[PDB]
PDB file of all heavy atoms in Angstrom:
ATOM      1  N   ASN B   9     101.734 111.232  85.378  1.00 13.69           N
ATOM      2  CA  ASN B   9     102.095 111.246  83.967  1.00 13.69           C
ATOM      3  C   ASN B   9     100.887 111.083  83.080  1.00 13.69           C
ATOM      4  O   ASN B   9     100.750 111.745  82.064  1.00 13.69           O
ATOM      5  CB  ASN B   9     103.150 110.172  83.688  1.00 13.69           C
ATOM      6  CG  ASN B   9     104.297 110.701  82.846  1.00 13.69           C
ATOM      7  OD1 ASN B   9     104.561 111.907  82.798  1.00 13.69           O
ATOM      8  ND2 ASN B   9     105.025 109.785  82.223  1.00 13.69           N
ATOM      9  N   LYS B  12      98.282 114.179  83.427  1.00 10.48           N
ATOM     10  CA  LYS B  12      98.608 115.368  82.652  1.00 10.48           C
ATOM     11  C   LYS B  12      98.004 115.342  81.278  1.00 10.48           C
ATOM     12  O   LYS B  12      97.183 116.216  80.914  1.00 10.48           O
ATOM     13  CB  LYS B  12     100.158 115.496  82.551  1.00 10.48           C
ATOM     14  CG  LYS B  12     100.850 115.875  83.848  1.00 10.48           C
ATOM     15  CD  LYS B  12     102.356 115.785  83.708  1.00 10.48           C
ATOM     16  CE  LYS B  12     103.041 115.930  85.064  1.00 10.48           C
ATOM     17  NZ  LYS B  12     104.489 116.151  84.897  1.00 10.48           N
ATOM     18  N   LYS B  13      98.352 114.326  80.468  1.00 12.47           N
ATOM     19  CA  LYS B  13      97.815 114.240  79.101  1.00 12.47           C
ATOM     20  C   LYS B  13      96.317 114.077  79.097  1.00 12.47           C
ATOM     21  O   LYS B  13      95.629 114.590  78.193  1.00 12.47           O
ATOM     22  CB  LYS B  13      98.495 113.103  78.355  1.00 12.47           C
ATOM     23  CG  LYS B  13      97.861 111.739  78.526  1.00 12.47           C
ATOM     24  CD  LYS B  13      98.420 110.737  77.518  1.00 12.47           C
ATOM     25  CE  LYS B  13      98.590 109.377  78.159  1.00 12.47           C
ATOM     26  NZ  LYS B  13      99.445 109.433  79.359  1.00 12.47           N
ATOM     27  N   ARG B  15      94.201 115.416  81.244  1.00 10.79           N
ATOM     28  CA  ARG B  15      93.650 116.780  81.462  1.00 10.79           C
ATOM     29  C   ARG B  15      93.744 117.589  80.187  1.00 10.79           C
ATOM     30  O   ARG B  15      92.771 118.269  79.829  1.00 10.79           O
ATOM     31  CB  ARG B  15      94.403 117.460  82.582  1.00 10.79           C
ATOM     32  CG  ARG B  15      93.990 117.038  83.991  1.00 10.79           C
ATOM     33  CD  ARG B  15      94.889 117.662  85.021  1.00 10.79           C
ATOM     34  NE  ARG B  15      95.004 116.864  86.242  1.00 10.79           N
ATOM     35  CZ  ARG B  15      96.114 116.318  86.670  1.00 10.79           C
ATOM     36  NH1 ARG B  15      97.256 116.435  86.017  1.00 10.79           N
ATOM     37  NH2 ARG B  15      96.101 115.603  87.803  1.00 10.79           N
ATOM     38  N   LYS B  36      89.786 111.465  72.869  1.00  6.36           N
ATOM     39  CA  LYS B  36      91.027 111.384  72.111  1.00  6.36           C
ATOM     40  C   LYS B  36      90.765 111.024  70.648  1.00  6.36           C
ATOM     41  O   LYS B  36      91.384 111.598  69.734  1.00  6.36           O
ATOM     42  CB  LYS B  36      91.961 110.372  72.750  1.00  6.36           C
ATOM     43  CG  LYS B  36      93.038 109.799  71.873  1.00  6.36           C
ATOM     44  CD  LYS B  36      94.150 109.180  72.722  1.00  6.36           C
ATOM     45  CE  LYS B  36      95.277 108.664  71.832  1.00  6.36           C
ATOM     46  NZ  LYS B  36      95.458 107.184  72.009  1.00  6.36           N
ATOM     47  N   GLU B  37      89.858 110.081  70.405  1.00  6.96           N
ATOM     48  CA  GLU B  37      89.467 109.755  69.027  1.00  6.96           C
ATOM     49  C   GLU B  37      88.906 110.976  68.332  1.00  6.96           C
ATOM     50  O   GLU B  37      89.283 111.299  67.184  1.00  6.96           O
ATOM     51  CB  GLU B  37      88.456 108.612  69.009  1.00  6.96           C
ATOM     52  CG  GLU B  37      89.058 107.223  69.219  1.00  6.96           C
ATOM     53  CD  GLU B  37      88.023 106.208  69.600  1.00  6.96           C
ATOM     54  OE1 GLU B  37      86.964 106.172  68.957  1.00  6.96           O
ATOM     55  OE2 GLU B  37      88.263 105.431  70.539  1.00  6.96           O
ATOM     56  N   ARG B  51      93.437 124.235  54.531  1.00 11.58           N
ATOM     57  CA  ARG B  51      93.832 124.242  53.139  1.00 11.58           C
ATOM     58  C   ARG B  51      92.673 124.605  52.227  1.00 11.58           C
ATOM     59  O   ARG B  51      92.839 125.340  51.254  1.00 11.58           O
ATOM     60  CB  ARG B  51      94.433 122.869  52.750  1.00 11.58           C
ATOM     61  CG  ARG B  51      95.623 122.465  53.594  1.00 11.58           C
ATOM     62  CD  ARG B  51      96.793 123.417  53.418  1.00 11.58           C
ATOM     63  NE  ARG B  51      97.964 122.937  54.135  1.00 11.58           N
ATOM     64  CZ  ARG B  51      98.936 122.215  53.607  1.00 11.58           C
ATOM     65  NH1 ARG B  51      98.897 121.864  52.346  1.00 11.58           N
ATOM     66  NH2 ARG B  51      99.945 121.829  54.372  1.00 11.58           N
ATOM     67  N   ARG B  78      85.166 137.530  30.577  1.00 26.48           N
ATOM     68  CA  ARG B  78      85.582 138.643  29.719  1.00 26.48           C
ATOM     69  C   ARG B  78      86.087 139.797  30.577  1.00 26.48           C
ATOM     70  O   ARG B  78      87.067 140.449  30.200  1.00 26.48           O
ATOM     71  CB  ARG B  78      84.407 139.091  28.861  1.00 26.48           C
ATOM     72  CG  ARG B  78      84.028 138.101  27.785  1.00 26.48           C
ATOM     73  CD  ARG B  78      85.243 137.633  27.012  1.00 26.48           C
ATOM     74  NE  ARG B  78      84.913 136.559  26.077  1.00 26.48           N
ATOM     75  CZ  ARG B  78      85.795 135.785  25.476  1.00 26.48           C
ATOM     76  NH1 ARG B  78      87.098 135.970  25.656  1.00 26.48           N
ATOM     77  NH2 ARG B  78      85.383 134.833  24.643  1.00 26.48           N
ATOM     78  N   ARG B  92      91.058 139.154  43.333  1.00 36.35           N
ATOM     79  CA  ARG B  92      89.619 138.897  43.410  1.00 36.35           C
ATOM     80  C   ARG B  92      89.026 139.303  44.746  1.00 36.35           C
ATOM     81  O   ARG B  92      87.861 139.693  44.806  1.00 36.35           O
ATOM     82  CB  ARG B  92      89.319 137.424  43.128  1.00 36.35           C
ATOM     83  CG  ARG B  92      89.462 137.059  41.653  1.00 36.35           C
ATOM     84  CD  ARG B  92      90.057 135.670  41.501  1.00 36.35           C
ATOM     85  NE  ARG B  92      90.434 135.384  40.127  1.00 36.35           N
ATOM     86  CZ  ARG B  92      91.523 135.886  39.529  1.00 36.35           C
ATOM     87  NH1 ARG B  92      92.354 136.680  40.179  1.00 36.35           N
ATOM     88  NH2 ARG B  92      91.772 135.565  38.279  1.00 36.35           N
ATOM     89  N   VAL B 121      86.471 139.147  20.152  1.00 33.05           N
ATOM     90  CA  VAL B 121      87.022 138.216  21.130  1.00 33.05           C
ATOM     91  C   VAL B 121      87.252 136.821  20.558  1.00 33.05           C
ATOM     92  O   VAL B 121      88.094 136.077  21.022  1.00 33.05           O
ATOM     93  CB  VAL B 121      86.101 138.130  22.360  1.00 33.05           C
ATOM     94  CG1 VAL B 121      86.198 139.418  23.164  1.00 33.05           C
ATOM     95  CG2 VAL B 121      84.672 137.889  21.952  1.00 33.05           C
ATOM     96  N   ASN B 122      86.480 136.460  19.510  1.00 28.08           N
ATOM     97  CA  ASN B 122      86.590 135.134  18.919  1.00 28.08           C
ATOM     98  C   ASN B 122      87.604 135.063  17.783  1.00 28.08           C
ATOM     99  O   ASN B 122      87.779 133.982  17.194  1.00 28.08           O
ATOM    100  CB  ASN B 122      85.220 134.686  18.406  1.00 28.08           C
ATOM    101  CG  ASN B 122      84.204 134.542  19.522  1.00 28.08           C
ATOM    102  OD1 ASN B 122      84.373 133.737  20.431  1.00 28.08           O
ATOM    103  ND2 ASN B 122      83.150 135.337  19.443  1.00 28.08           N
TER     104      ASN B 122
ATOM    105  P     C E  35      92.114 126.155  16.189  1.00 17.49           P
ATOM    106  OP1   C E  35      93.566 126.226  15.904  1.00 17.49           O
ATOM    107  OP2   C E  35      91.616 125.128  17.161  1.00 17.49           O
ATOM    108  O5'   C E  35      91.627 127.575  16.690  1.00 17.49           O
ATOM    109  C5'   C E  35      91.479 128.650  15.755  1.00 17.49           C
ATOM    110  C4'   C E  35      90.600 129.746  16.292  1.00 17.49           C
ATOM    111  O4'   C E  35      89.190 129.347  16.208  1.00 17.49           O
ATOM    112  C3'   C E  35      90.776 130.079  17.769  1.00 17.49           C
ATOM    113  O3'   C E  35      91.918 130.877  18.010  1.00 17.49           O
ATOM    114  C2'   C E  35      89.461 130.765  18.116  1.00 17.49           C
ATOM    115  O2'   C E  35      89.431 132.091  17.636  1.00 17.49           O
ATOM    116  C1'   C E  35      88.474 129.931  17.287  1.00 17.49           C
ATOM    117  N1    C E  35      87.853 128.844  18.075  1.00 17.49           N
ATOM    118  C2    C E  35      86.844 129.182  18.966  1.00 17.49           C
ATOM    119  O2    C E  35      86.526 130.388  19.066  1.00 17.49           O
ATOM    120  N3    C E  35      86.237 128.245  19.693  1.00 17.49           N
ATOM    121  C4    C E  35      86.619 126.965  19.567  1.00 17.49           C
ATOM    122  N4    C E  35      86.009 126.040  20.312  1.00 17.49           N
ATOM    123  C5    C E  35      87.639 126.572  18.651  1.00 17.49           C
ATOM    124  C6    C E  35      88.236 127.523  17.925  1.00 17.49           C
ATOM    125  P     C E  36      92.640 130.805  19.423  1.00 18.35           P
ATOM    126  OP1   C E  36      93.971 131.459  19.310  1.00 18.35           O
ATOM    127  OP2   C E  36      92.566 129.404  19.917  1.00 18.35           O
ATOM    128  O5'   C E  36      91.724 131.696  20.379  1.00 18.35           O
ATOM    129  C5'   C E  36      91.413 133.028  20.003  1.00 18.35           C
ATOM    130  C4'   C E  36      90.355 133.636  20.899  1.00 18.35           C
ATOM    131  O4'   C E  36      89.109 132.935  20.773  1.00 18.35           O
ATOM    132  C3'   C E  36      90.659 133.546  22.417  1.00 18.35           C
ATOM    133  O3'   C E  36      91.600 134.534  22.835  1.00 18.35           O
ATOM    134  C2'   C E  36      89.275 133.714  23.005  1.00 18.35           C
ATOM    135  O2'   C E  36      88.879 135.070  23.002  1.00 18.35           O
ATOM    136  C1'   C E  36      88.427 132.964  21.997  1.00 18.35           C
ATOM    137  N1    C E  36      88.134 131.568  22.413  1.00 18.35           N
ATOM    138  C2    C E  36      87.153 131.350  23.371  1.00 18.35           C
ATOM    139  O2    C E  36      86.546 132.329  23.833  1.00 18.35           O
ATOM    140  N3    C E  36      86.872 130.078  23.767  1.00 18.35           N
ATOM    141  C4    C E  36      87.533 129.066  23.267  1.00 18.35           C
ATOM    142  N4    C E  36      87.222 127.814  23.669  1.00 18.35           N
ATOM    143  C5    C E  36      88.545 129.237  22.270  1.00 18.35           C
ATOM    144  C6    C E  36      88.813 130.511  21.884  1.00 18.35           C
ATOM    145  P     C E  39      89.974 132.326  36.448  1.00 13.14           P
ATOM    146  OP1   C E  39      90.127 133.261  37.578  1.00 13.14           O
ATOM    147  OP2   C E  39      91.175 131.783  35.760  1.00 13.14           O
ATOM    148  O5'   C E  39      89.090 131.102  36.947  1.00 13.14           O
ATOM    149  C5'   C E  39      87.827 131.308  37.581  1.00 13.14           C
ATOM    150  C4'   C E  39      87.114 130.024  37.820  1.00 13.14           C
ATOM    151  O4'   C E  39      86.787 129.368  36.582  1.00 13.14           O
ATOM    152  C3'   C E  39      87.900 128.954  38.615  1.00 13.14           C
ATOM    153  O3'   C E  39      87.827 129.166  40.007  1.00 13.14           O
ATOM    154  C2'   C E  39      87.212 127.665  38.162  1.00 13.14           C
ATOM    155  O2'   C E  39      86.044 127.426  38.905  1.00 13.14           O
ATOM    156  C1'   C E  39      86.829 127.975  36.725  1.00 13.14           C
ATOM    157  N1    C E  39      87.756 127.400  35.722  1.00 13.14           N
ATOM    158  C2    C E  39      87.753 126.033  35.495  1.00 13.14           C
ATOM    159  O2    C E  39      87.020 125.303  36.151  1.00 13.14           O
ATOM    160  N3    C E  39      88.597 125.526  34.556  1.00 13.14           N
ATOM    161  C4    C E  39      89.384 126.356  33.842  1.00 13.14           C
ATOM    162  N4    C E  39      90.183 125.820  32.919  1.00 13.14           N
ATOM    163  C5    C E  39      89.376 127.751  34.057  1.00 13.14           C
ATOM    164  C6    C E  39      88.549 128.231  34.992  1.00 13.14           C
ATOM    165  P     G E  40      89.108 128.853  40.931  1.00 13.99           P
ATOM    166  OP1   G E  40      88.672 129.005  42.340  1.00 13.99           O
ATOM    167  OP2   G E  40      90.245 129.659  40.425  1.00 13.99           O
ATOM    168  O5'   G E  40      89.410 127.319  40.675  1.00 13.99           O
ATOM    169  C5'   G E  40      88.560 126.297  41.173  1.00 13.99           C
ATOM    170  C4'   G E  40      88.890 124.980  40.568  1.00 13.99           C
ATOM    171  O4'   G E  40      88.676 125.031  39.141  1.00 13.99           O
ATOM    172  C3'   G E  40      90.313 124.505  40.722  1.00 13.99           C
ATOM    173  O3'   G E  40      90.569 123.916  41.976  1.00 13.99           O
ATOM    174  C2'   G E  40      90.489 123.577  39.534  1.00 13.99           C
ATOM    175  O2'   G E  40      89.919 122.300  39.825  1.00 13.99           O
ATOM    176  C1'   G E  40      89.653 124.255  38.467  1.00 13.99           C
ATOM    177  N9    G E  40      90.447 125.149  37.619  1.00 13.99           N
ATOM    178  C8    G E  40      90.520 126.519  37.728  1.00 13.99           C
ATOM    179  N7    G E  40      91.313 127.059  36.843  1.00 13.99           N
ATOM    180  C5    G E  40      91.795 125.983  36.104  1.00 13.99           C
ATOM    181  C6    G E  40      92.690 125.932  34.999  1.00 13.99           C
ATOM    182  O6    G E  40      93.249 126.872  34.451  1.00 13.99           O
ATOM    183  N1    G E  40      92.907 124.634  34.558  1.00 13.99           N
ATOM    184  C2    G E  40      92.333 123.529  35.114  1.00 13.99           C
ATOM    185  N2    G E  40      92.653 122.380  34.547  1.00 13.99           N
ATOM    186  N3    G E  40      91.486 123.544  36.127  1.00 13.99           N
ATOM    187  C4    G E  40      91.277 124.800  36.581  1.00 13.99           C
ATOM    188  P     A E  42      95.093 123.672  47.265  1.00 15.37           P
ATOM    189  OP1   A E  42      94.560 124.055  48.613  1.00 15.37           O
ATOM    190  OP2   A E  42      95.343 124.709  46.250  1.00 15.37           O
ATOM    191  O5'   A E  42      96.452 122.870  47.513  1.00 15.37           O
ATOM    192  C5'   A E  42      97.600 123.508  48.074  1.00 15.37           C
ATOM    193  C4'   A E  42      98.640 122.518  48.494  1.00 15.37           C
ATOM    194  O4'   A E  42      98.168 121.837  49.705  1.00 15.37           O
ATOM    195  C3'   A E  42      98.954 121.405  47.505  1.00 15.37           C
ATOM    196  O3'   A E  42     100.331 121.044  47.595  1.00 15.37           O
ATOM    197  C2'   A E  42      98.089 120.258  47.966  1.00 15.37           C
ATOM    198  O2'   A E  42      98.541 118.977  47.598  1.00 15.37           O
ATOM    199  C1'   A E  42      98.102 120.455  49.483  1.00 15.37           C
ATOM    200  N9    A E  42      96.919 119.940  50.167  1.00 15.37           N
ATOM    201  C8    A E  42      95.650 120.471  50.090  1.00 15.37           C
ATOM    202  N7    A E  42      94.776 119.792  50.829  1.00 15.37           N
ATOM    203  C5    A E  42      95.525 118.800  51.433  1.00 15.37           C
ATOM    204  C6    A E  42      95.191 117.774  52.338  1.00 15.37           C
ATOM    205  N6    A E  42      93.954 117.586  52.805  1.00 15.37           N
ATOM    206  N1    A E  42      96.186 116.960  52.743  1.00 15.37           N
ATOM    207  C2    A E  42      97.415 117.162  52.274  1.00 15.37           C
ATOM    208  N3    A E  42      97.860 118.084  51.425  1.00 15.37           N
ATOM    209  C4    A E  42      96.864 118.892  51.046  1.00 15.37           C
ATOM    210  P     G E  79     110.717 117.905  81.349  1.00 21.94           P
ATOM    211  OP1   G E  79     110.450 119.212  82.051  1.00 21.94           O
ATOM    212  OP2   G E  79     112.074 117.303  81.429  1.00 21.94           O
ATOM    213  O5'   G E  79     109.660 116.857  81.904  1.00 21.94           O
ATOM    214  C5'   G E  79     108.276 117.164  81.950  1.00 21.94           C
ATOM    215  C4'   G E  79     107.455 115.946  82.249  1.00 21.94           C
ATOM    216  O4'   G E  79     107.624 114.952  81.216  1.00 21.94           O
ATOM    217  C3'   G E  79     107.811 115.183  83.530  1.00 21.94           C
ATOM    218  O3'   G E  79     107.274 115.786  84.705  1.00 21.94           O
ATOM    219  C2'   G E  79     107.250 113.796  83.252  1.00 21.94           C
ATOM    220  O2'   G E  79     105.853 113.777  83.438  1.00 21.94           O
ATOM    221  C1'   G E  79     107.519 113.638  81.762  1.00 21.94           C
ATOM    222  N9    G E  79     108.797 112.945  81.491  1.00 21.94           N
ATOM    223  C8    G E  79     109.905 113.450  80.870  1.00 21.94           C
ATOM    224  N7    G E  79     110.899 112.587  80.763  1.00 21.94           N
ATOM    225  C5    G E  79     110.375 111.433  81.340  1.00 21.94           C
ATOM    226  C6    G E  79     110.996 110.183  81.533  1.00 21.94           C
ATOM    227  O6    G E  79     112.121 109.808  81.189  1.00 21.94           O
ATOM    228  N1    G E  79     110.145 109.284  82.180  1.00 21.94           N
ATOM    229  C2    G E  79     108.866 109.590  82.599  1.00 21.94           C
ATOM    230  N2    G E  79     108.213 108.604  83.204  1.00 21.94           N
ATOM    231  N3    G E  79     108.296 110.761  82.425  1.00 21.94           N
ATOM    232  C4    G E  79     109.102 111.649  81.803  1.00 21.94           C
ATOM    233  P     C E  97      97.576 116.276  91.082  1.00 33.70           P
ATOM    234  OP1   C E  97      97.639 115.254  90.028  1.00 33.70           O
ATOM    235  OP2   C E  97      98.408 117.490  90.978  1.00 33.70           O
ATOM    236  O5'   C E  97      96.068 116.717  91.285  1.00 33.70           O
ATOM    237  C5'   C E  97      95.105 115.789  91.766  1.00 33.70           C
ATOM    238  C4'   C E  97      93.887 116.491  92.283  1.00 33.70           C
ATOM    239  O4'   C E  97      94.199 117.208  93.504  1.00 33.70           O
ATOM    240  C3'   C E  97      93.291 117.558  91.375  1.00 33.70           C
ATOM    241  O3'   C E  97      92.505 117.026  90.322  1.00 33.70           O
ATOM    242  C2'   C E  97      92.513 118.427  92.349  1.00 33.70           C
ATOM    243  O2'   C E  97      91.300 117.800  92.705  1.00 33.70           O
ATOM    244  C1'   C E  97      93.434 118.409  93.568  1.00 33.70           C
ATOM    245  N1    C E  97      94.340 119.572  93.609  1.00 33.70           N
ATOM    246  C2    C E  97      93.813 120.828  93.871  1.00 33.70           C
ATOM    247  O2    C E  97      92.603 120.907  94.096  1.00 33.70           O
ATOM    248  N3    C E  97      94.638 121.899  93.893  1.00 33.70           N
ATOM    249  C4    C E  97      95.945 121.742  93.637  1.00 33.70           C
ATOM    250  N4    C E  97      96.712 122.823  93.653  1.00 33.70           N
ATOM    251  C5    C E  97      96.508 120.471  93.355  1.00 33.70           C
ATOM    252  C6    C E  97      95.678 119.414  93.341  1.00 33.70           C
ATOM    253  P     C E  98      92.447 117.790  88.899  1.00 34.45           P
ATOM    254  OP1   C E  98      91.811 116.898  87.917  1.00 34.45           O
ATOM    255  OP2   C E  98      93.796 118.327  88.650  1.00 34.45           O
ATOM    256  O5'   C E  98      91.454 119.008  89.177  1.00 34.45           O
ATOM    257  C5'   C E  98      90.159 118.794  89.627  1.00 34.45           C
ATOM    258  C4'   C E  98      89.442 120.091  89.973  1.00 34.45           C
ATOM    259  O4'   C E  98      90.099 120.715  91.099  1.00 34.45           O
ATOM    260  C3'   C E  98      89.476 121.150  88.900  1.00 34.45           C
ATOM    261  O3'   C E  98      88.523 120.956  87.863  1.00 34.45           O
ATOM    262  C2'   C E  98      89.253 122.419  89.695  1.00 34.45           C
ATOM    263  O2'   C E  98      87.889 122.571  90.060  1.00 34.45           O
ATOM    264  C1'   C E  98      90.046 122.102  90.965  1.00 34.45           C
ATOM    265  N1    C E  98      91.440 122.642  90.878  1.00 34.45           N
ATOM    266  C2    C E  98      91.655 124.023  91.037  1.00 34.45           C
ATOM    267  O2    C E  98      90.678 124.762  91.276  1.00 34.45           O
ATOM    268  N3    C E  98      92.909 124.498  90.942  1.00 34.45           N
ATOM    269  C4    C E  98      93.934 123.671  90.706  1.00 34.45           C
ATOM    270  N4    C E  98      95.162 124.178  90.638  1.00 34.45           N
ATOM    271  C5    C E  98      93.731 122.275  90.530  1.00 34.45           C
ATOM    272  C6    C E  98      92.467 121.798  90.613  1.00 34.45           C
ATOM    273  P     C E 109     104.531 118.982  82.357  1.00 32.30           P
ATOM    274  OP1   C E 109     105.116 118.299  83.543  1.00 32.30           O
ATOM    275  OP2   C E 109     103.039 119.037  82.208  1.00 32.30           O
ATOM    276  O5'   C E 109     105.090 120.466  82.309  1.00 32.30           O
ATOM    277  C5'   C E 109     106.469 120.709  82.103  1.00 32.30           C
ATOM    278  C4'   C E 109     106.728 122.161  81.877  1.00 32.30           C
ATOM    279  O4'   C E 109     106.114 122.599  80.624  1.00 32.30           O
ATOM    280  C3'   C E 109     106.170 123.098  82.907  1.00 32.30           C
ATOM    281  O3'   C E 109     106.955 123.191  84.094  1.00 32.30           O
ATOM    282  C2'   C E 109     106.057 124.426  82.139  1.00 32.30           C
ATOM    283  O2'   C E 109     107.329 125.038  82.030  1.00 32.30           O
ATOM    284  C1'   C E 109     105.640 123.920  80.782  1.00 32.30           C
ATOM    285  N1    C E 109     104.170 123.915  80.603  1.00 32.30           N
ATOM    286  C2    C E 109     103.496 125.109  80.340  1.00 32.30           C
ATOM    287  O2    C E 109     104.146 126.146  80.251  1.00 32.30           O
ATOM    288  N3    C E 109     102.150 125.071  80.186  1.00 32.30           N
ATOM    289  C4    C E 109     101.486 123.954  80.301  1.00 32.30           C
ATOM    290  N4    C E 109     100.148 123.936  80.133  1.00 32.30           N
ATOM    291  C5    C E 109     102.135 122.701  80.565  1.00 32.30           C
ATOM    292  C6    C E 109     103.455 122.747  80.706  1.00 32.30           C
ATOM    293  P     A E 133     100.428 105.733  81.014  1.00 45.18           P
ATOM    294  OP1   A E 133      99.553 106.885  80.702  1.00 45.18           O
ATOM    295  OP2   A E 133     100.437 105.175  82.381  1.00 45.18           O
ATOM    296  O5'   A E 133     100.041 104.548  80.001  1.00 45.18           O
ATOM    297  C5'   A E 133      99.844 104.827  78.613  1.00 45.18           C
ATOM    298  C4'   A E 133      98.746 103.960  78.026  1.00 45.18           C
ATOM    299  O4'   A E 133      99.276 102.603  77.828  1.00 45.18           O
ATOM    300  C3'   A E 133      97.488 103.814  78.884  1.00 45.18           C
ATOM    301  O3'   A E 133      96.361 103.722  78.024  1.00 45.18           O
ATOM    302  C2'   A E 133      97.714 102.455  79.539  1.00 45.18           C
ATOM    303  O2'   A E 133      96.513 101.804  79.967  1.00 45.18           O
ATOM    304  C1'   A E 133      98.395 101.680  78.434  1.00 45.18           C
ATOM    305  N9    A E 133      99.191 100.522  78.883  1.00 45.18           N
ATOM    306  C8    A E 133      99.063  99.245  78.417  1.00 45.18           C
ATOM    307  N7    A E 133      99.875  98.394  78.981  1.00 45.18           N
ATOM    308  C5    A E 133     100.593  99.171  79.894  1.00 45.18           C
ATOM    309  C6    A E 133     101.617  98.861  80.799  1.00 45.18           C
ATOM    310  N6    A E 133     102.105  97.633  80.977  1.00 45.18           N
ATOM    311  N1    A E 133     102.109  99.851  81.559  1.00 45.18           N
ATOM    312  C2    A E 133     101.600 101.082  81.412  1.00 45.18           C
ATOM    313  N3    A E 133     100.644 101.518  80.584  1.00 45.18           N
ATOM    314  C4    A E 133     100.166 100.501  79.852  1.00 45.18           C
ATOM    315  P     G E 134      95.543 105.072  77.615  1.00 40.53           P
ATOM    316  OP1   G E 134      96.296 105.719  76.503  1.00 40.53           O
ATOM    317  OP2   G E 134      95.246 105.822  78.840  1.00 40.53           O
ATOM    318  O5'   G E 134      94.186 104.497  77.020  1.00 40.53           O
ATOM    319  C5'   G E 134      93.472 103.452  77.676  1.00 40.53           C
ATOM    320  C4'   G E 134      93.284 102.235  76.800  1.00 40.53           C
ATOM    321  O4'   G E 134      92.691 102.653  75.551  1.00 40.53           O
ATOM    322  C3'   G E 134      94.558 101.496  76.442  1.00 40.53           C
ATOM    323  O3'   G E 134      94.271 100.112  76.274  1.00 40.53           O
ATOM    324  C2'   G E 134      94.906 102.091  75.081  1.00 40.53           C
ATOM    325  O2'   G E 134      95.708 101.262  74.266  1.00 40.53           O
ATOM    326  C1'   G E 134      93.533 102.299  74.482  1.00 40.53           C
ATOM    327  N9    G E 134      93.454 103.382  73.496  1.00 40.53           N
ATOM    328  C8    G E 134      94.492 104.139  72.990  1.00 40.53           C
ATOM    329  N7    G E 134      94.093 105.025  72.135  1.00 40.53           N
ATOM    330  C5    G E 134      92.718 104.857  72.066  1.00 40.53           C
ATOM    331  C6    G E 134      91.718 105.559  71.336  1.00 40.53           C
ATOM    332  O6    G E 134      91.887 106.490  70.533  1.00 40.53           O
ATOM    333  N1    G E 134      90.444 105.067  71.566  1.00 40.53           N
ATOM    334  C2    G E 134      90.158 104.032  72.427  1.00 40.53           C
ATOM    335  N2    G E 134      88.870 103.688  72.531  1.00 40.53           N
ATOM    336  N3    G E 134      91.064 103.387  73.131  1.00 40.53           N
ATOM    337  C4    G E 134      92.312 103.846  72.912  1.00 40.53           C
TER     338        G E 134
END
Side-chain angles (χ1 to χ4, degrees):
Chain B
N9 226 21
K12 288 172 190 194
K13 86 168 143 304
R15 282 174 207 116
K36 158 161 183 242
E37 281 163 46
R51 302 297 184 94
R78 291 311 172 194
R92 286 144 191 75
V121 289
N122 297 298

